[model samples]
Target: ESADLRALAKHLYDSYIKSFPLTKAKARAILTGKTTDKSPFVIYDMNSLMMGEDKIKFKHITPLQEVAIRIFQGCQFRSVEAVQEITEYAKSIPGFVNLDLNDQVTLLKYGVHEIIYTMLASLMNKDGVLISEGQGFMTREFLKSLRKPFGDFMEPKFEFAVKFNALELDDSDLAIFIAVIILSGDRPGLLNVKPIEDIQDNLLQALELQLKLNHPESSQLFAKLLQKMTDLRQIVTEHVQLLQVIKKTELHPLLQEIYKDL
Candidate 1:
């Protein structure tokens, strides 16, 4: 039974990862200047973007506005795209469509950011996320250079990202990981959660069996994966606080729009 489940998970993983060509294609294409738009893509952070500054430059947006654009814009785009990818992926899972709509929404609302960050962590190289592909990089060094809580907001995810990347999980590993997160029975307000719990348990078995097959030398990676979920939730708690602060400014609108559907 477990053997069949592992094969099924592998099939799903291969299918969805194949669907993400546009993501990597855009990354390499834009940064390599393969685009017809020869005009430079701006970071939108130089002007009025305070790392403790005065007399901000050409853009003249507010300090918070600058940070918001820099920090949230890429993530919002990533998160939105993740939803599109994951929604199709979710539909591929058996019994997902039969769940109550509110339950679906609840699961997504609490889970999307963590899932998006998981995929991003899996994809990112050491320098961290490069916006517009190669243009507008948000490296850990860059975020650390920002002032106060602005810097703090970006820090946790990067921290989580680094630790997560260390797990060395491949696409197959990630597929099972993603399934476990989405199928978690404990998500708030979920009706008929027992069914989802059963699914979650089966996926967990798949992940464990698959991991043993793929990583013969593995240690407590399973336990760590479980811990990583808790770690993700903790980081997003800070992210939500950051969102609350950004909401005070009109800069929050972009995130507000993105989050509305989540």
Candidate 2:
């Protein structure tokens, strides 16, 4: 019965859902961070970031460090692209641009990794995540096989992705959720806290209303989703600590900038 919420929901669906960024080909394309030429395979080493050269060849004695670095760099490249997409998405959120520019950047700085994990559900299942644009499937077992910290990275994400899938949220629900994430009130260095909080409240209202209208029989789904937000915060915290162990590998400038302090 609320026209404002209805309109807001519609806008979210239009902007976020309609512009939904991760098609399989797009995923394949961005994962490599290459646009001009399409490559069937990619290989990253300490010195070179090469793609489409040859298929990955695994040797019985291949150094775990060798495999670990490739996967690490691949994830880093993909994150760079993901942040770019999230930046565009954040800008599209109503009232996002109206906030002080530094506050907007602050929200995105803290919010992008959570957004990545949230959207990651679409490309993953219980067994593994689809990588290289469906060219390869990185199974949970294979990821767990890498050296200590590298092996540990995807486990929590896989766990989160699996349960998040259980929510059965479609693209429309995700649109509002992503908006809620970017417009969060708790992000550090948010100078315009009250306005950001105001917008977050509106999005949360829209989320609650939409969920009730769409999933009336599902009790307490809203509470569960909110809890997922808390879990995401914890996941990002753990991710930051894990990231500190990674030797800087000429990371993407945007990624370097965002993670500099956090």
Candidate 3:
């Protein structure tokens, strides 16, 4: 059984890692402003952006509005990429394609946000999440600078990322965890709950097996990771409410597609 799960974990690890835009090494180098051998994208820090301020070029927008717009704009492309990545990995999970089509859409719609937060742990620390294909690092304070619901959008995910980062899970561990999340039986509107539950049960056992093999010293780590799903589900629920508050703003089609019904 362990050997079978090891093979499952390897398949999942390959699929999951293949979806990343940048390796952690490349992301770190970009964030620190060290140009890579291939290419380095620009970072969108306060100072880098404020250099444009010295140029005296633009803005009818107030400072808070400007920052909020820029930061939110910065994430849209990434958010779209994140959805694609999650969907691709979701397709790779064993038996995922066999699911009812509407059930599949419903699961992906509700679960993508949770998986995004899970994957964000890799590009994030306690301070911030890497953005702009790892070229930019937006600080927590910078994110907090925005007003009202825009500001509220990220703090909960940030808090979750910080604690999750402490787990030090590599892509291999994350692959199974991400699969477990998408395969969850708890998402509303699932048409065939027993099959989904059975799939999740197998994945959960694989997850526990993987955690044991990977973190031999941390006996309780598997439970901690499972416990995090509770927090992630709550975060996504709150996130949907916040998105409703920003409904007047023009949201990306990619974003609207996944989140529209949720």
Candidate 4:
């Protein structure tokens, strides 16, 4: 039954992709883990593509079907606040807290990046733009021009910067530092939240100057970091699972709304 359901979901997802040829290449790239581009245009189109699939046209399908669609598409359709709330709720699950710092960081990275990429795909589809170099990553002028529409949508302002100083860091510091950079750059507001703030501090402390190089405590710290990474991975997996449940319950109405104009 599980296999059958997944097959059906795939069928629907494929049909939606077929209808929106422009998003096909980008969506495939994301699902196949080819790149880290997180333009909302690409992400949005991907969700649209998936929701529009024939299999998603409910005829008394199980609640799980709705959950699957929502989980798959919610990151694109819902507001940033809604997504954050879901992520926070997932983090509250008991086993999630016990994950080692490295694992926790891994989960955080995967969840945020996935949603970012998926949202970009969606926006690309709406604007009728090819999601290659030209469409990916908004320029300063482009971002400026988007202020009105973006304001209407209540989207946060984005800024980009380059830091040459980061080159001095060692591997463990680099890992945590890069994660911090990505998270801060992508979701600064979320960083202000307590749990995320604690996690961020922990990652930074674990990668501090004193912790680097060939010291006796370094090996032990590194081991702990690896355990943290495992815990984080499990937390992310559990969040994905929760999303799966929500998708089966909340996706049909959203799918219907998306297809209304089509």
All candidates' lDDT scores? Answer: 0.66, 0.73, 0.74, 0.37
Which candidate has the highest TM-score of all? 3
**C-alpha displacement of 247 in model 1, angstroms?**
1.4
TM-score (C-alpha) between model 2 and the true structure: 0.79
lDDT ranking, best first: 3, 2, 1, 4
Q: Which candidate gets the maximum lDDT versus the true structure?
A: 3
lDDT of 1 by residue, 96-147 (tens): 6778777777777677777877776643445546543343444565666676
Give the alpha carbon lDDT tens digit for every residue of 191-255 in model 4. Answer: 23445555455444444433444245445554444344444344445445544554464426765
> How much lDDT does candidate 1 score?
0.66
Give residue 88's lDDT in candidate 1 (0 to 100). 73
Give the distance in Å from residue 246's predicted Cα in candidate 1 to where it truly belongs.
Answer: 1.6
RMSD of 1: 6.2
Instruction: Kindly list the per-residue Cα lDDT of model 2 for residues 1-262, writing each as its tens digit.
Output: 4788878888887777445555534553544445664433322232222332134332211223355766676676667767877788787778988999899889998898888898887677777776554444466776777788788998999999889878877777888888898888887677779999998999999999988887888888888899999889899999987887775432356645643543
lDDT value, candidate 4, whole model: 0.37
Error of 3 at 260 (Å): 4.7
TM-score of predicted model 4? 0.25
TM-score, every prediction:
0.76, 0.79, 0.82, 0.25
Which structure is stronger by TM-score: 2 or 3? Answer: 3
Q: Which ranges in model 1 have alpha carbons more than 4 Å from their true place?
A: 22-71, 133-136, 249-262
Is 1 or 2 the stronger prediction by TM-score? 2
Which RMSD values do the candidates have, in order?
A: 6.2, 7.0, 5.0, 16.3
Cα shift from native, residue 162, model 3 (Å): 1.2
